[PDB]
Amino acid sequence: VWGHTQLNRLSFLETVPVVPLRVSDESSEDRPTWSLPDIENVAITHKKPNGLVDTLAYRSVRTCRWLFDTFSLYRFGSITESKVISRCLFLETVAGVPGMVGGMLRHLSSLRYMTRDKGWINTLLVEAENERMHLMTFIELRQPGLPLRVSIIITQAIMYLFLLVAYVISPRFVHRFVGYLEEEAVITYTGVMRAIDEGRLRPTKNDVPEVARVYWNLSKNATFRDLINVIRADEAEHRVVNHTFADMHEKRLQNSVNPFVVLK
Amino acid sequence: VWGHTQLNRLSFLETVPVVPLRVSDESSEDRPTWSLPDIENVAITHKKPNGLVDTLAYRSVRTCRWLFDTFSLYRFGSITESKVISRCLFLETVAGVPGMVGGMLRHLSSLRYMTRDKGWINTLLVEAENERMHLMTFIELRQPGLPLRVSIIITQAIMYLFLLVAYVISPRFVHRFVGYLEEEAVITYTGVMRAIDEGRLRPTKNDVPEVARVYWNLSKNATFRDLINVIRADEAEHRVVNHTFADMHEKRLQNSVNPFVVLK
Numbered sequence: 001v002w003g004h005t006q007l008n009r010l011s012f013l014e015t016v017p018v019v020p021l022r023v024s025d026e027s028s029e030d031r032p033t034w035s036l037p038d039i040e041n042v043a044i045t046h047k048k049p050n051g052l053v054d055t056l057a058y059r060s061v062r063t064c065r066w067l068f069d070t071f072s073l074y075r076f077g078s079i080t081e082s083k084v085i086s087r088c089l090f091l092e093t094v095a096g097v098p099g100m101v102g103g104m105l106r107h108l109s110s111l112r113y114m115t116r117d118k119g120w121i122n123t124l125l126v127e128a129e130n131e132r133m134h135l136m137t138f139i140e141l142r143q144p145g146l147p148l149r150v151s152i153i154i155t156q157a158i159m160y161l162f163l164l165v166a167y168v169i170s171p172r173f174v175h176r177f178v179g180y181l182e183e184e185a186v187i188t189y190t191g192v193m194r195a196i197d198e199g200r201l202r203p204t205k206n207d208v209p210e211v212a213r214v215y216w217n218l219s220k221n222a223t224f225r226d227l228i229n230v231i232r233a234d235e236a237e238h239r240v241v242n243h244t245f246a247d248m249h250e251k252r253l254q255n256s257v258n259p260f261v262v263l264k
Numbered sequence: 265v266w267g268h269t270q271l272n273r274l275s276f277l278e279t280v281p282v283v284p285l286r287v288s289d290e291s292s293e294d295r296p297t298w299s300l301p302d303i304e305n306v307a308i309t310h311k312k313p314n315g316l317v318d319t320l321a322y323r324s325v326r327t328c329r330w331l332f333d334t335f336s337l338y339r340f341g342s343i344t345e346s347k348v349i350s351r352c353l354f355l356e357t358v359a360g361v362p363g364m365v366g367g368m369l370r371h372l373s374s375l376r377y378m379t380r381d382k383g384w385i386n387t388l389l390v391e392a393e394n395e396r397m398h399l400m401t402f403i404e405l406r407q408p409g410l411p412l413r414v415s416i417i418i419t420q421a422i423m424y425l426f427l428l429v430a431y432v433i434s435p436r437f438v439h440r441f442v443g444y445l446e447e448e449a450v451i452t453y454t455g456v457m458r459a460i461d462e463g464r465l466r467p468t469k470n471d472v473p474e475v476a477r478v479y480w481n482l483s484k485n486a487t488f489r490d491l492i493n494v495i496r497a498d499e500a501e502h503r504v505v506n507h508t509f510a511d512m513h514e515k516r517l518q519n520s521v522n523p524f525v526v527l528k
């Protein structure tokens with residue numbers, strides 16, 4: 001019901017009051033569809049670096065893991081629900097950024113060269129969205145305290161500003177950098193799980209937030225485990241797709257068609 | 265068929281020779297669905313400016329018409345199909361931006377203050393995709409000469425900065441600035457559909473690009489005029505949404521639910 005009599009109205013400001021809040025509309029329409037026993041076997045992989053650049057990217061992720069695992073106390077304590085959600089909550093705020101700068105820079109190339117994209121731009125922009133929905137789900141489990149709330153703001157500034165020039169300078173490095181970051185998302189999200197399953201972790205959020213059920217389409221009775229599993233799936237998807245793009249780049253196949261448009 | 269055996273593969277670089285170039289995987293699957301006898305009726309409007317900001321927006325958008333008209337000789341000549349296409353082309357290189365720098369920032373804020381964004385980002389993104397898919401369409405109706413190929417780049421610089429900084433200081437000034445450009449746009453495109461009737465201009469490209477056929481889901485019979493008629497209604501979807509956004513800034517409503525997620 002979107003035709004000219006609507007299109008000719010100047011503003012719809014008076015309709016903000018009457019329209020509802022529906023969890024459904026937080027996301028774009030591009031929802032992940034996983035079936036749990038299938039993705040139940042997603043498993044940790046490690047792609048060989050090739051040049052300097054991969055090796056460079058690869059040190060960057062490992063130099064960063066070793067910082068972040070000490071400063072976030074993560075090791076010195078028996079694992080809990082709490083210290084995990086804080087880890088991820090924090091981790092997903094950078095997980096937004098490259099997904100975005102990604103398309104936003106590919107997008108401006110397309111507009112300025114007057115050329116095709118062949119379906120990269122929307123693939124990335126949803127990698128940005130999915131990583132933001134992770135965050136909108138984790139926020140529901142725990143609001144962070146002023147400490148973290150602040151460190152996010154600095155981090156983001158720093159990260160944004162690395163990632164935009166690292167893209168302009170070397171897309172191959174960034175896709176490669178990200179690919180390596182997700183091998184670590186997969187590692188951890190399987191730890192978390194091994195933990196639940198053995199019992200070393202006992203979860204109290206067996207409710208799964210409204211946003212999280214609709215986004216992922218889960219059962220009304222989906223567990224804390226269930227939710228990690230799909231997030232763990234989502235993290236594997238991105239692992240491939242970037243290491244893919246980095247290879248693609250590596251071989252000057254970076255105006256080729258994005259293979260994953262087909263591969264649905 | 266996306267599952268745990270494709271998630272566990274390091275790469276897909278070798279699938280990129282076997283994988284088709286199809287015009288329906290350029291855009292996302294978020295394409296307008298107009299019906300032409302209806303969107304035939306779209307009108308020319310004006311929204312009154314309130315403050316300095318609303319007034320200032322209107323001065324720059326007007327002054328930029330005046331200059332680009334006098335610098336593109338739109339006055340001294342005939343309404344030849346040349347400088348109609350050659351015009352939209354250039355101009356969709358800049359329409360591709362506000363949406364992308366707006367969606368970028370709200371994503372970044374959503375992330376960094378962990379707050380729900382309520383259907384703005386995606387709306388704001390597809391606005392830009394849409395505009396790009398005008399330029400893509402036009403690119404097949406006429407390929408531009410180097411002069412204009414440059415003019416375009418040295419312009420994405422000015423405008424990717426301007427819009428970047430304005431949208432921080434005053435997204436309202438931009439969501440109005442855009443709102444007043446679309447006005448001049450939805451004019452210029454009724455100017456051209458008028459002139460195809462009056463018969464002052466006879467469109468020689470009454471083939472419509474396969475890109476812009478899938479996207480707008482037109483016929484194979486559909487004239488140039490019909491293509492204009494849809495593009496024009498897209499531009500009018502924009503005109504009002506951006507004003508509604510500007511107004512939602514004016515009334516401290518920047519974090520209310522997008523009133524177009526429903527009105528879909």
Ligand SMILES: COc1ccc(N2CCN(Cc3cc(=O)oc4c(O)c(O)ccc34)CC2)cc1
Nearest residue numbers: 061064065068091092094095181182184185188
């Ligand atoms: C200063 O900014 C940074 C600080 C640390 C990092 N890293 C810490 C953890 N990260 C891997 C990671 C581990 C994980 O257990 O979950 C993740 C996760 O859920 C993501 O979405 C992205 C990365 C990770 C490696 C580098 C990156 C940027």
Ligand SMILES: [Fe+3]
Nearest residue numbers: 092095131134
């Ligand atoms: Fe993540």
Ligand SMILES: [Fe+3]
Nearest residue numbers: 095131182185
């Ligand atoms: Fe991630």
Ligand SMILES: [Fe+3]
Nearest residue numbers: 356359398449
């Ligand atoms: Fe336009």
Ligand SMILES: [Fe+3]
Nearest residue numbers: 359446449499
């Ligand atoms: Fe426009």
Ligand SMILES: [O-]
Nearest residue numbers: 355356359449
């Ligand atoms: O435009």
